[PDB]
Amino acid sequence: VTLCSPTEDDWPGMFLLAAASFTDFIGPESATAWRTLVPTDGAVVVRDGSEVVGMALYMDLRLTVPGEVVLPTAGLSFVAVAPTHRRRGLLRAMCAELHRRIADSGYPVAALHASEGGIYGRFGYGPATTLHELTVDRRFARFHADAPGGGLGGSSVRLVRPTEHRGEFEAIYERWRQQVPGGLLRPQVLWDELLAEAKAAPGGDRESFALLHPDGYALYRVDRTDLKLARVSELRAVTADAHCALWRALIGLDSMERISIITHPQDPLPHLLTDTRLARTTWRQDGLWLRIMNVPAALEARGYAHEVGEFSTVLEVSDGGRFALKIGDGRARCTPTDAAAEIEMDRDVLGSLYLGAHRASTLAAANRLRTKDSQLLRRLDAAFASDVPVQTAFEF
Amino acid sequence: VTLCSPTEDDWPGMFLLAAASFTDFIGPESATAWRTLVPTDGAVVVRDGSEVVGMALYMDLRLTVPGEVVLPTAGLSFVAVAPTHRRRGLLRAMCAELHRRIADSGYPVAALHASEGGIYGRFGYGPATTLHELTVDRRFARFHADAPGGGLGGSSVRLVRPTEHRGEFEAIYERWRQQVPGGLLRPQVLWDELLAEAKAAPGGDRESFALLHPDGYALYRVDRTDLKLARVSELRAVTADAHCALWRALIGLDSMERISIITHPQDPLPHLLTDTRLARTTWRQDGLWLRIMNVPAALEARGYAHEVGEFSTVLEVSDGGRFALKIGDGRARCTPTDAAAEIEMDRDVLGSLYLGAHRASTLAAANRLRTKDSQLLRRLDAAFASDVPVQTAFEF
Amino acid sequence: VTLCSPTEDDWPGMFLLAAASFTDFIGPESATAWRTLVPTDGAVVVRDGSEVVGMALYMDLRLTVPGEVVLPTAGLSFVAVAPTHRRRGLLRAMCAELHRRIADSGYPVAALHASEGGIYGRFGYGPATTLHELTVDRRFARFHADAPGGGLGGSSVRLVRPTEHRGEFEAIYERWRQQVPGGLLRPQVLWDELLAEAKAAPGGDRESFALLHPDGYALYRVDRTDLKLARVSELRAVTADAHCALWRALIGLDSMERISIITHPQDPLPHLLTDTRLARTTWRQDGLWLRIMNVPAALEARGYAHEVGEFSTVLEVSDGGRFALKIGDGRARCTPTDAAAEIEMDRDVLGSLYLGAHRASTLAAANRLRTKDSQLLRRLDAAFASDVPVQTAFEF
Amino acid sequence: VTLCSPTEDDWPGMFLLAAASFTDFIGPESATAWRTLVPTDGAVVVRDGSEVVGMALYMDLRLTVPGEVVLPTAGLSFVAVAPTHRRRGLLRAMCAELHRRIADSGYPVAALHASEGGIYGRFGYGPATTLHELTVDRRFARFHADAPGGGLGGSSVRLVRPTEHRGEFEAIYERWRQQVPGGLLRPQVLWDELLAEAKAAPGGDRESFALLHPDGYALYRVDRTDLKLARVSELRAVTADAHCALWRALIGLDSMERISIITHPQDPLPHLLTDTRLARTTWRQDGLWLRIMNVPAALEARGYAHEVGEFSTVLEVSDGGRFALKIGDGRARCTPTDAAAEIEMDRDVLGSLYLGAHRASTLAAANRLRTKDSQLLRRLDAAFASDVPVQTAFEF
Ligand SMILES: Clc1cccc(COc2ccccc2CNCc2ccncc2)c1
Ligand SMILES: Clc1cccc(COc2ccccc2CNCc2ccncc2)c1
Ligand SMILES: Clc1cccc(COc2ccccc2CNCc2ccncc2)c1
Ligand SMILES: Clc1cccc(COc2ccccc2CNCc2ccncc2)c1
């Protein structure tokens, strides 16, 4: 059992383990586009001896955090242990090696999407965004008198074929991802993949359509089996007017009974309707997970709420150092100290706080973060909150 | 079609309309206890001529708002229009008369639980609390190393018969309802009802059990049909230690596959487990709805977040006046003005902001509240937030 | 194995066989009311030797046929063979003895409700009415501009407790049953039973309500398990105005998603709505079955359509005689002949034609009735049609 | 927003709107065959300005009505409004323009298949045929002793591959459609389409088989997911013997539990079995809708029942003229009059009467057609009835 960077000869073994590990992995073409995002030395394999029994890699990503700050982010992905090689510490060894490489390379944060909720906490990843599925019974849906874009005259939204408006989607998405925490830069090869998945598949997905506004788009397709359900795969709106105009058009899908979308907890959709209850939360799950690799670089990088007055404390991350933390004027200074800790928490908890998806007070009530100062808790809650609600870009 | 306060002779007509309108209403005994909370002049009926074709009333309640302030609250309930008398403006006439009486009597707020989401907005009620059902697959559930009460030695929790510990439940609930926004004073007659519903019913509900801690209780019963589901009807914990100790005991129900509870979005339960995903959000809905009857009395009554610096603005409520609003040191002054409005919103929107369940920024993005100042929005969001997460007491 | 009229000593054996044969049969009280309708010599039992292994009886009924003619009708009921005594010819022997008694007593027709569709054809019973379940999604239901009773001002319909308006229900039903083919006289003891079943049952049915109009009523109750379904157990309307007014009130059950009723194929409900498709046919089955005991007495008794000109033919019923049949001026003369048959059919087929539920042309296309004259078929179809659509009264 | 006949340049916009509007529309090939049935000037489009936001067209059809009379029929189809352009009166404007063209061109009737039941009534279309799904549990099914084709010796039915017997199917269908009201001439291009859909589809429908008799055929295929269900897509029988022989063969599909077919309410199948209840009505819906374009041309064209004696009345169609209507000897004369109306009804109601699927008495009881003469109602019911039961040909 060796742990090595893979050679070109290892990749067929890795595509076999992939196919057996992930139902979405069709074959080598499934990996081509993503693989252009893996740097030299971004991948590890474990061999028996030899055949591939374990793999893991990271991609070079750009993640938007509160204050519209973009961090270089190591996106862990393609993580698999062969079913023959369970309980042999292979995931732990692979994560320790990648984390060493990611830290040495200078990434301040790593990120991933978890197959299960019980695995990545112990490696310092905290769930940092929240997926919220809304299902609308569009047969009852009526827009509130207050809702934008109710006026008579032309619609600002067009029904279009996705493959014919690639440039407009790219430009809108680029504007979205720079202004929203959770945003990820989407490279050309991932737009190539997305537009390929928009075609009908022989005995697979139905053809995708787009609704296009100058300041937003929605991609949606009818469900393969439930012919009265339209699933929105992605809606990116840069203005409230674009968000409301796109939902007016989706609620105009008169063939459908239901429209579903995977959105975020602060989606204003329910408030656009005379009956807020028509936007039913049908599913909720962790989205992006974060591991803070360098505590001071990450805490100094993001912006903080201007509404909380200057305060200083001492934060200890369980295996991640102790820091004098001063937050004022929406910025934070985070320097080494041996002064007594006022706040303690494991690394994973800091990742859960980092984009504003989880309140310090909520984590404190579970004893995940400990302090004897309730004023300090209120100040942390306020300071770490994000003005712009955190959203989930695309899984990887 | 007259609208009158009912006489004793009207009540059999009201119990018939009740039985036909609400599946929970068994018969007159269903109304006895609640009826002691209805003041003289708390009820209206509509007669055809004569038979009862419409009814509505309010109860005298005490509602806890942020800052641990308790307001006298008119609880609208027993609202019904006969199926013979739809679309005749009976609900509008009944709500206008009760609102006139409630305002004249000096209540600063009215509240209700809505049968449907599309009815009460137009009468100025905004959804103000959020019901969040968590279902735990307790067969996988393991407590995080950080979770309180993991130590060896005696449990602080006892399994008890509800009817034998009425005093302990009453005292714990009284402590809970005074410290949590959404809390409602529960009168002796409603404890009489609750303890009656805890017995097994011939072909009805199964017997309720209690888990009792010095600082919390849970009432739960196995589902009538799904024998592997335990439903927690109520869990009131005054400390984090009590909340964690009660969940350790519920996850010790080794007969069950699943434990469900109707809780609030900030329930720390998921954070107590090594897999946060095991606490699945299975249902979400509006809970308590609020109508602000007197804008200045309500805005001056509640406490505001100390973390936002003093600010002044001008708020217009659509049919509810314009006010100079100054918020500083966690308190607000709200005085008449004819100065230009900086913020506008319908009355229902203010009720949705009032307990901190909905952010001003979220309502602004749906255009439910309008301002040209994004700094003012961030300040309102921060100021109206509740330190202690808003919860739902008991429906009425 | 003897076949005898039962003595008082046989009835406990008959109630045991009943309880084991019919899930609705609770115990002896289940039989009390119906048993007052059984004449002396109306019942047969088969004994092993001795215990009761088979039973059957008939009740004295009054059945309305086209032309508003009321026939004395033998209603076969309480028919059971012990599961120990299958395939021993017990049903055949019991039906032969009762049919001999029914014919000797002078009944022109027998009738029953069949537990299965494959049993009673061979004993000469034809399905003569059609049960049609309509389920309305009342959340979409809007009345057509043409529909009666759309005017502003008082409703003609009242929501009432069934037990307090027994006289009004009795009088309306009596008017209904005399004007509709399929109508059955309902004796006081069956009104006693119906009003007993209207109360809530401990772990059983929910409480029944009534909608009362001068010229119609509906009895309905919410489903025991599906709390958004109201089931109409009976709607009797003597005028179109009463039918429409009652449906306006049922569609005013704003708590419900769906209203279901077991009605007849010509129920005008769908035509009252702007969307006829909202009245979904969810179930169809044979209702009342008829055996013509005396062909000429039955054919001369009922009225025929005035729109067909006088015609004469020769009808042979397979074991029931050959007759010269002359139909003109809505009346028929049916006399013995040995002239060549122009029409042949088994006895069961004549019962299926008798109330107008099945067309002669439809039965001819299945070769159930044979003739070489297509003009004669059109004439029979027209003549046997019922002006007033055939309905099903109450099962027995 | 212009309304125009489309140019060749408009058709890609129309195929996009089609794909987004109809789940069956795969792509341009989906329209090729049907499009040969659209005359010059048969189509309208609405453009924003420009892109296609609305479309509608009619095909040249031949519809069989009672008396075996074949009318030129405008078949409305491909009707779609973009989800961006709801509630802008586009459907009303498109239907007004096509109806003007259809009337000017000399069509006496228009027809369509409705996506929803609430749309086409207000444009004068009445549901005129009834789809009735029968599901047979063929494991219990036994043919009545009376049923044709029970004799020993060769079967008259052959199991064949549809594509190898196109000529026999074409000839049988042509005989069927000329003798049955509802029949439609099926052009060669629609036989090309039907025989293409009979092949297995990669992850789609299973291969279709045919049962072939000299005087009838059935096309059936096993369900894609329920492998014990055979769905009959089409059964056309010109004689009762062919209908019974084909059902004997379908009930010989010993692999299947259930056979389903979409047939008409008068299908004699149930009567062929010893248990009529085995032919369960599992679904009922409106089929073909009719708009009478020229009241007198349509009323004079169809044949009437010979069994009703000569009568005269005055019929007013709400926006369609008043006529002296004389019906005798199976023919009708319908001439202009200003004499007082004896019968009134909206245009849609006349379309519902026209093929005999709905009785005048049933529509009168919903007040859809008004008269003060009950004798006149019985005469209309009898006269408009169809000797040969109305069936549905193929949807378009
Ligand atoms: Cl060389 C390489 C690096 C990173 C990712 C991949 C592709 O990995 C997958 C492809 C299809 C299905 C599943 C996976 C693995 N699960 C994460 C994922 C999900 C969706 N899309 C992309 C990645 C290949
Ligand atoms: Cl005189 C009176 C005043 C206020 C309330 C009531 C009781 O009203 C009900 C009782 C049982 C079922 C349903 C209702 C009405 N829906 C609100 C509600 C729900 C649960 N518990 C209490 C009230 C009687
Ligand atoms: Cl002595 C006697 C004569 C006739 C009928 C009966 C009662 O028979 C039943 C009672 C309850 C359930 C089932 C049956 C038998 N199936 C027919 C039926 C159904 C509903 N209601 C009345 C009769 C007793
Ligand atoms: Cl240019 C043209 C004129 C008329 C019809 C059509 C084809 O229209 C469709 C094709 C496939 C699916 C759905 C539709 C539209 N719904 C009616 C329909 C249903 C089934 N078969 C034919 C028509 C194209």
Tab-separated table of N, CA, C and O in Angstrom, chain C residues 66-93:
chain	number	residue	atom	x	y	z
C	66	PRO	N	-89.565	3.304	-15.027
C	66	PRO	CA	-89.902	4.404	-15.946
C	66	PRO	C	-91.430	4.549	-16.103
C	66	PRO	O	-92.159	3.518	-16.115
C	67	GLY	N	-91.898	5.797	-16.163
C	67	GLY	CA	-93.329	6.166	-16.138
C	67	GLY	C	-93.782	6.436	-14.722
C	67	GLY	O	-94.967	6.536	-14.529
C	68	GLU	N	-92.858	6.518	-13.753
C	68	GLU	CA	-93.195	6.740	-12.318
C	68	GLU	C	-94.120	5.627	-11.806
C	68	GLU	O	-94.909	5.873	-10.894
C	69	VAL	N	-93.928	4.404	-12.274
C	69	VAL	CA	-94.733	3.249	-11.826
C	69	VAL	C	-93.955	2.589	-10.704
C	69	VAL	O	-92.772	2.409	-10.886
C	70	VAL	N	-94.625	2.241	-9.617
C	70	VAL	CA	-93.992	1.620	-8.432
C	70	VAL	C	-94.357	0.130	-8.408
C	70	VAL	O	-95.555	-0.209	-8.323
C	71	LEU	N	-93.371	-0.756	-8.494
C	71	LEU	CA	-93.627	-2.214	-8.429
C	71	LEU	C	-93.289	-2.764	-7.049
C	71	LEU	O	-92.235	-2.491	-6.498
C	72	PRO	N	-94.122	-3.694	-6.539
C	72	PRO	CA	-93.699	-4.552	-5.457
C	72	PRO	C	-92.477	-5.339	-5.959
C	72	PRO	O	-92.517	-5.910	-7.016
C	73	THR	N	-91.412	-5.331	-5.159
C	73	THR	CA	-90.094	-5.895	-5.497
C	73	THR	C	-89.596	-6.744	-4.346
C	73	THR	O	-89.629	-6.271	-3.240
C	74	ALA	N	-89.203	-7.977	-4.635
C	74	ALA	CA	-88.517	-8.864	-3.681
C	74	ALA	C	-87.027	-8.518	-3.702
C	74	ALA	O	-86.387	-8.794	-4.730
C	75	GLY	N	-86.530	-7.918	-2.625
C	75	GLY	CA	-85.079	-7.582	-2.510
C	75	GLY	C	-84.281	-8.696	-1.877
C	75	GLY	O	-84.368	-8.818	-0.656
C	76	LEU	N	-83.583	-9.500	-2.661
C	76	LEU	CA	-82.720	-10.595	-2.136
C	76	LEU	C	-81.591	-9.928	-1.336
C	76	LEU	O	-81.100	-8.900	-1.793
C	77	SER	N	-81.222	-10.498	-0.193
C	77	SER	CA	-80.187	-9.956	0.703
C	77	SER	C	-79.755	-11.051	1.681
C	77	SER	O	-80.405	-12.134	1.715
C	78	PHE	N	-78.734	-10.770	2.487
C	78	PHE	CA	-78.243	-11.666	3.547
C	78	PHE	C	-77.952	-13.039	2.952
C	78	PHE	O	-78.277	-14.070	3.533
C	79	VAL	N	-77.392	-13.072	1.749
C	79	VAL	CA	-77.097	-14.329	1.028
C	79	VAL	C	-75.672	-14.760	1.406
C	79	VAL	O	-74.777	-14.017	1.117
C	80	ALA	N	-75.477	-15.947	1.983
C	80	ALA	CA	-74.155	-16.397	2.463
C	80	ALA	C	-74.129	-17.914	2.442
C	80	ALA	O	-75.146	-18.550	2.768
C	81	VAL	N	-73.012	-18.454	1.997
C	81	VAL	CA	-72.649	-19.886	2.145
C	81	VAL	C	-71.394	-19.963	3.010
C	81	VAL	O	-70.446	-19.164	2.804
C	82	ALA	N	-71.399	-20.853	3.989
C	82	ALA	CA	-70.250	-21.029	4.892
C	82	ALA	C	-69.015	-21.414	4.067
C	82	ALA	O	-69.116	-22.116	3.047
C	83	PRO	N	-67.811	-20.952	4.477
C	83	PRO	CA	-66.580	-21.239	3.734
C	83	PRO	C	-66.239	-22.723	3.764
C	83	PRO	O	-65.520	-23.164	2.879
C	84	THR	N	-66.843	-23.462	4.703
C	84	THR	CA	-66.741	-24.938	4.840
C	84	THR	C	-67.579	-25.671	3.809
C	84	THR	O	-67.408	-26.891	3.694
C	85	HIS	N	-68.486	-24.983	3.113
C	85	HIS	CA	-69.562	-25.661	2.346
C	85	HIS	C	-69.613	-25.095	0.928
C	85	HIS	O	-70.659	-25.153	0.308
C	86	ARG	N	-68.486	-24.613	0.411
C	86	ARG	CA	-68.402	-24.140	-0.987
C	86	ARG	C	-68.632	-25.309	-1.945
C	86	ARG	O	-68.495	-26.478	-1.536
C	87	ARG	N	-69.053	-24.979	-3.164
C	87	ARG	CA	-69.106	-25.897	-4.332
C	87	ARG	C	-70.023	-27.089	-4.041
C	87	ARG	O	-69.754	-28.173	-4.531
C	88	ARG	N	-71.095	-26.896	-3.292
C	88	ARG	CA	-72.042	-27.988	-2.955
C	88	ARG	C	-73.434	-27.647	-3.490
C	88	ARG	O	-74.365	-28.268	-3.004
C	89	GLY	N	-73.557	-26.638	-4.362
C	89	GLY	CA	-74.827	-26.226	-4.984
C	89	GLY	C	-75.760	-25.533	-3.994
C	89	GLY	O	-76.943	-25.438	-4.307
C	90	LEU	N	-75.261	-24.998	-2.870
C	90	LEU	CA	-76.144	-24.403	-1.829
C	90	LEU	C	-76.771	-23.082	-2.309
C	90	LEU	O	-77.980	-22.890	-2.087
C	91	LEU	N	-76.004	-22.194	-2.938
C	91	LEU	CA	-76.537	-20.928	-3.485
C	91	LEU	C	-77.630	-21.229	-4.536
C	91	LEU	O	-78.675	-20.576	-4.454
C	92	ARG	N	-77.416	-22.200	-5.430
C	92	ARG	CA	-78.367	-22.551	-6.500
C	92	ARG	C	-79.676	-23.032	-5.846
C	92	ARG	O	-80.731	-22.568	-6.261
C	93	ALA	N	-79.612	-23.976	-4.922
C	93	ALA	CA	-80.782	-24.512	-4.211
C	93	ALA	C	-81.473	-23.364	-3.476
C	93	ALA	O	-82.707	-23.285	-3.584
